[PDB]
């Protein structure tokens, strides 16, 4: 019947325990979703080309030129940590868990409702809302992964993070192949670089439509749709960071002369002249064994060209790197490249009671020091005379190519067969949870956007759309805009995300770091006198672990 | 129930392979149909007589005189290729399949919605839309083919070709016997050529009515209708073409003197004088054996009176032919007769953002050379003396009947017991798929309008009508217009057409012609910036086959 | 996911582009560049890198003499001009046994 509810709201998190120190962390989320009728029932192919911004010499990083297909369908995405866990559950997870596995995922749409908007045309405007019990809501679940994978977490467009606030689905779109050339320049370049959009190569064209690819369920006010349980196969995720760098792998040298009295100035000493020492080095042409020169098992992290932009057929794009600066946790202004920056709105953490269109931003700094500090690096000649003369060293203050602001650290890559690095840490609340593995023959070792990556295939996207509510005046052969009764839908989305985690132990005398509420941050987790909520970012890998 | 959906939307084209190189093609096609109530609840017997146009001497070809019964019903017709396949599927079929079989067909009307229209009459105009749960959609399936068969592909009045675009059903009418006389004329005919219309013979009157011949289902908003699976019995269809003509049948003559260097001028010479040759010819009284005078196994194609008009009881009509002019591939303007021409609107291929009533058109230049090039013919005396003189050869340039424009090829026919010719190629998207065989004692060898011809029966036409939503002021004895509430219906139609195809094989060293996307035709298959779509025609017989 | 286009074209035309519609320093999104607020197609996070750059026409010496550092793939957009084949894309030289 029309008057029978078709599902249950549920936003609880249950930590069920098991053997050998494991726990099932089953997260339930539920939302009210508001879907207007699409601006047009038709697919569009649209190009963005901001020559007004890129023509200005030196702004070549500001290129937004792309081709996209705009669809009438809307995308429902719950792939963000903020959709499942409130700050307290995250506190429990990151204070008590060591490793986190992703097991299953579920979702269902229920309590569909459709309403039509009537305008009175009275001189003082007014309008009345009527239910359309016979109208339908179109739902398509792309379980075969045929449609382009468009994770909403990247553009800050996933479902909201507050159970008690309604949400909307992101309008759906996907990239269409294009060609583009943009020669970089500097304030001071002559003329105007070639800044052109060559078009789209026919052999690369791929136009998709939901109708021709996925079975679409027509859901009336008395219907409900459930996707069915999905089972992941992702690699484990560690909730502990690693503090060791190359300088701290292995056995320290024996300190022949320890301090005798305590004090800030009372350092220890090794007591053996460096050229006279015992051990192993790869620097086979010198006798010096030092903490900077002694052989180590392998290398942690890697140096990458920072703010390197690589051009391909589609134009320029920044080179991604796994980790950012090391030891930059003290200042946000020193985050530099690698360390992600999130800019989000009021559906996803910004103080809700705020106004204006300045997004709320933060830069994530991880606890792991697998990064680099290029100002401390240097390249010196193989003879290895010490102290080194100006001519035998390439310091970071020495220019490359004559540019005084560009040094070798900008064009210097140290990735090799000895590199060790960790996966990207989870970012709460705005971080994406999982991502799809690329369809390339050879695949990357990690993704920067999601802690979990999907070895074979993983959950299909869910698309919604208001069915066309035509007026009596429809006429297919007319080329004008289709006449639609102004219709909108509110429906309830409910999902289940099932994790499996292992509790942590204490391997050391000291207490490790933990997240805790303190006076400097208490108000960030409570509503305001006028009902304003905000979700601040929380670190994931608080606990430390031994690397080697 | 009112609040429960009674069906699911589906387009997906599913390829399922069998053993021995066969593949099942299941084509799901789903639309949203829009149906206003009929203009009059009564059947109408109507005459059209464009006497004004045909009174102009020489315009007899433009005769449009006929009598029809106009019915209060609307026909839902899915008998065209564009209703089932998008260009990608057509590409796959016509590039990989050598033959095609029609297997089964099903359809269903569901998710029925009925709405009424009310007008406020307020000084600023406005009108509201209300659902009517008690209102019914009348649906009739003519399973026994009682009603006259009337495919809509000939009028471009079938269901539309875009799943995301709603479609109308075509108002239904059929022919009513009439008598017509039209003496042909030329600009310069004195007076008025005899041009009269006589009416209907009593013995050919047939007033079919749906209500008295077909069960009718009354569907409310919560009902559904399923036709059931119809299974075809048509002869198999070929997606290949025959390039051979009589000149390419048999064993070519041995070349005693083969060429000795590459070049377009370095031809070979047979080497044996023409009356000294060996071989067989049907010319019982001449010693010449030549590639024209040699005996061939049979005749491929046939000549026919082109742009010839024949008259019967009902008036003049054009004589149909299986194939058109030969050599049209070199110049499209020379195709003319035989090669079909399709004029269609926006529902069925024309760009949907175009203005005006001028429809898109195209002539179909098939790949099969079973046609004729009448300017290349000649008829000469049985004596066969050469080089033939004027008195002894009937050249195509010779005048016939005192007319410069008419030569013998206009009246020439060479169909006979030795004729071998092909079935019509499918025309995507606007071609008709299947056609009902005539009920004559002797049946045509083929139909020019569809590749498949039903042997015993083929699926009943689906007739729809909005039930009469009468007002309170009804008076069955009234001669004035009946008063009905303005009702219209939106009902989803879902069809399944199932084919069986044979995959092709590489019979030759060289590659064959294949449909492909290129920098020219590229954007024909993708939507415009404002969403405009268009479907262009696409050939079907690109792969050559060996006739003999 | 492309960026939502807050203002779309209204007629067909070579110049009728679309527009993201939001000032760049005011865009929501995620980027690896932690010391800027500009979010742009060149700067927005992507899962990984498709293809890689190499010191093209590098010659490297070993015990047996110099050899060209091989690379997996060639130029992008070279399909439109043979003069830009450059490194990566192989060149075959052959005779009458083989074509």
């Amino acid at each position, epitope marked *: 019947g029309v008057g029978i509810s078709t599902g249950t709201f549920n936003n609880q998190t249950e930590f069920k325990f098991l053997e050998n120190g494991w726990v099932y962390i089953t997260a339930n989320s539920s939302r009210l979703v508001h879907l207007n009728m699409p601006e047009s029932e038709n697919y569009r192919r649209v*190009v963005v*080309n901001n*020559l*007004d911004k890129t*023509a200005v010499n030196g702004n070549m990083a500001l290129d937004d030129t792309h081709a996209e297909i705009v669809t009438p369908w809307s995308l429902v995405d719950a792939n963000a940590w903020g959709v499942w866990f409130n700050p307290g559950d995250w506190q429990l997870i990151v204070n008590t868990m060591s490793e986190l596995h992703l097991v299953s995922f579920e979702q269902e749409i229920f309590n569909v409702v459709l309403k039509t908007v009537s305008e009175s045309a009275t001189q003082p405007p007014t309008k009345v809302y009527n239910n359309d019990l016979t109208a339908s809501l179109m739902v398509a679940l792309d379980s075969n992964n045929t449609m382009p994978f468009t994770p909403a977490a990247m553009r800050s467009e996933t479902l909201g993070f507050y159970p008690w606030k309604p949400t909307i689905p992101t309008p759906w779109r996907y990239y269409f192949q294009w060609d583009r*050339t943009l*020669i970089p320049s500097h304030t001071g*370049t*002559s*003329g*105007t*670089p*070639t800044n*052109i*959009y*060559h*078009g*789209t190569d026919p052999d690369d064209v791929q136009f998709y439509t939901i109708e021709n690819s996925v079975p679409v369920h027509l859901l009336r006010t008395g219907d409900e749709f459930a996707t069915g349980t999905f089972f992941f196969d992702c690699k484990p995720c560690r909730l502990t960071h690693t503090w060791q760098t190359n300088r701290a792998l292995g056995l320290p040298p024996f300190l022949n002369s320890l301090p005798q009295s305590e004090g800030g100035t009372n350092f220890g000493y090794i007591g053996v002249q460096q050229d006279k020492r015992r051990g192993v080095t790869q620097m086979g042409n010198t006798n010096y064994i030092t903490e900077a020169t002694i052989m180590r098992p392998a290398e942690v992290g890697y140096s990458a060209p920072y703010y390197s932009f690589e051009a391909s057929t589609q134009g320029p794009f920044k080179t991604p790197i796994a980790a950012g600066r090391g030891g930059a946790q003290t200042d946000e202004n020193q985050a530099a490249d690698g360390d992600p920056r999130y800019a989000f709105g009021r559906q996803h953490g910004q103080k809700t009671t705020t106004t204006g269109e300045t997004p709320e931003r933060f830069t994530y700094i991880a606890h792991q020091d697998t990064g680099r500090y290029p100002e401390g690096d240097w390249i010196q000649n193989i003879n290895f005379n010490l102290p080194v003369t100006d001519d035998n060293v390439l310091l970071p203050t020495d220019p490359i190519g004559g540019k005084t602001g560009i040094n070798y650290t900008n064009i210097f890559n140290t990735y090799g067969p000895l590199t060790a690095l960790n996966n990207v840490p989870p970012v709460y609340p705005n971080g994406q949870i999982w991502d799809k593995e690329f369809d390339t023959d050879l695949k990357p070792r990690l993704h920067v956007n999601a802690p979990f990556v999907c070895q074979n295939n993983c959950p299909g996207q869910l698309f919604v759309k208001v069915a066309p509510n035509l007026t009596n005046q429809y006429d297919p052969d007319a080329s004008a805009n289709m006449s639609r009764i102004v219709t909108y839908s509110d429906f309830w989305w409910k999902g289940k995300l099932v994790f499996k985690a292992k509790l942590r132990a204490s391997h050391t005398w000291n207490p490790i770091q933990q997240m805790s509420i303190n006076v400097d941050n208490q108000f960030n987790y409570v509503p305001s006198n006028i009902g304003g909520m905000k979700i601040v970012y929380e670190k994931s890998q608080l606990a430390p672990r031994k690397l080697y | 129930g009112v609040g429960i959906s009674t069906g699911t939307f589906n387009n997906q084209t599913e390829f399922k392979f069998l053993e021995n190189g066969w593949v099942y093609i299941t084509a799901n096609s789903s639309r949203l149909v829009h149906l206003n109530m009929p203009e009059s609840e009564n059947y109408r017997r109507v005459v059209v007589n464009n006497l004004d146009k045909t009174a102009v001497n020489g315009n007899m070809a433009l005769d449009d005189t006929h009598a029809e019964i106009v019915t209060p019903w609307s026909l839902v017709d899915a008998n065209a290729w564009g209703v089932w396949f998008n260009p990608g599927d057509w590409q796959l079929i016509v590039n990989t399949m050598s033959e095609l079989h029609l297997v089964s067909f099903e359809q269903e009307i569901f998710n029925v919605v009925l709405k009424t229209v009310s007008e406020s009459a307020t000084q600023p105009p406005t009108k509201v839309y209300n659902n009517d749960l008690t209102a019914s959609l009348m649906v009739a399936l003519d399973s026994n083919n009682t009603m006259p068969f009337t495919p809509a592909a000939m009028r471009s009045e079938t269901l539309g070709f875009y799943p995301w675009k709603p479609t109308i059903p075509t108002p239904w009418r059929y022919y009513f016997q009439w008598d017509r006389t039209l003496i042909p004329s030329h600009t310069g005919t004195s007076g008025t050529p005899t041009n009269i219309y006589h009416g209907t013979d009593p013995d050919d009157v047939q007033f079919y009515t749906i209500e008295n011949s077909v069960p009718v289902h009354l569907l409310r908003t919560g009902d559904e209708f399923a036709t059931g699976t119809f299974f075809f019995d048509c002869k198999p269809c070929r997606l290949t073409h025959t390039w051979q003509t009589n000149r390419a049948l048999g064993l070519p003559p041995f070349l005693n003197s083969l060429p000795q260097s590459e070049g377009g001028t370095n031809f070979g010479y047979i080497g044996v004088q023409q009356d000294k040759r060996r071989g067989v010819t049907q010319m019982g009284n001449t010693n010449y054996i030549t590639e024209a005078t040699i005996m061939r196994p049979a005749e491929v194609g046939y000549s026919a009176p082109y742009y010839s008009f024949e008259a019967s009881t009902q008036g003049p009509f054009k004589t149909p032919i299986a194939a058109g002019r030969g050599g049209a591939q070199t110049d499209e303007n020379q195709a003319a007769d035989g090669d079909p021409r399709y004029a269609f609107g926006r529902q069925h291929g024309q760009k949907t953002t175009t203005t005006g009533e001028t429809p898109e058109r195209f002539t179909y230049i098939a790949h099969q050379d079973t046609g004729r090039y009448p300017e290349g013919d000649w008829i000469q005396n049985i004596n066969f003396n050469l080089p033939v003189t004027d008195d002894n050869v009937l050249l195509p340039t010779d005048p016939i009947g005192g007319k410069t424009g008419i030569n013998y090829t206009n009246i020439f026919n060479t169909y006979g017991p030795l004729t071998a010719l092909n079935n019509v190629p499918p025309v995507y998207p606007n071609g008709q798929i299947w056609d009902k065989e005539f009920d004559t004692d002797l049946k045509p060898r083929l139909h020019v309008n569809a590749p498949f011809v039903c042997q015993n029966n083929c699926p009943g036409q689906l007739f729809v009508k909005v039930a009469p939503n009468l007002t309170n002021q009804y008076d069955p004895d009234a001669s004035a217009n009946m008063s009905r509430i303005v009702t219209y219906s939106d009902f989803w139609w879902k069809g399944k057409l199932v084919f069986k195809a044979k995959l092709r094989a590489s019979h030759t060293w060289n590659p064959i012609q294949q449909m492909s996307i290129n*920098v*020219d035709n*590229q*954007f024909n298959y993708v939507p*415009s*910036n404002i969403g405009g779509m268009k479907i262009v025609y696409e050939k079907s017989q690109l792969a050559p086959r060996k006739l003999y | 996911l492309p960026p939502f286009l807050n203002s779309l074209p209204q007629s*067909e*035309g*070579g*110049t009728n*582009f679309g527009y993201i519609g939001v000032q760049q320093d005011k865009r929501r999104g995620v980027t690896q560049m932690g010391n800027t607020n500009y979010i742009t197609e060149a700067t927005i996070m992507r899962p990984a890198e498709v293809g890689y750059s190499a010191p093209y026409y590098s010659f490297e010496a070993s015990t047996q003499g110099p050899f060209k550092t091989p690379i997996a793939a060639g130029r992008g957009g070279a399909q*439109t*001009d043979e003069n830009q084949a450059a490194d990566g894309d192989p060149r075959y030289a052959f005779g009458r046994q083989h074509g």
Partner: antibody
Amino acid sequence: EVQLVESGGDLVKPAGSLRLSCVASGFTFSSYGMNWVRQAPGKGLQWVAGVNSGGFTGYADAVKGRFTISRDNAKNTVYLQMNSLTAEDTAVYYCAKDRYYCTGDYCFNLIAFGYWGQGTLVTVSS
Amino acid sequence: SVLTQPTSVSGSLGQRVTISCSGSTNNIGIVGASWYQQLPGKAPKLLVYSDGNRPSGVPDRFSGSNSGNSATLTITGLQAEDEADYYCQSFDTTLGAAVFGGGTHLTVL
């Protein structure tokens, strides 16, 4: 090297029509747009029309709605049908090809460059 | 739309000379000028691209510059053969049409 040739310019009466032709070799005709540019005796230059690879066309207001430009990619030939000619159309017409490969509706017909052909003269009078 | 140019310019043999063209934000301020040279009765040949580069075989004498809504062309080591008419060219981003300047004649003394 890029070579272009033109033909079809002739003295013609006002109104009516005239049809120019330009042919190309040495470059991939498909990947490049083609443009006509005209110059009256002793006067300045004026772009006439351009046609990208996909059949999309562009025109200047002085001819928009009067002339129709096209291509035949199979013959490296471009045509300009000049209907409704008037005396002001008397000028020399040149055939050009842009520097940078380009196709589609959003493609600028002519930015900078072209190995302009020798050109064809046109006069409208009676 | 149209680009402004000077009517004529003069220069002595071996000296340097300059020519200027003016436009608007949507023609020059976005796409730089491209300079063409036309000999008496011949089809014009380009001298300098908007890219700032010159075609193969063009003497190094010519060079171009751009500033805001205007552009400029210069000839170093003026020669007798350089006496010709010159034209600036750009692309009106609003009308989507190539815009050619009014032309300039250079006199060599």
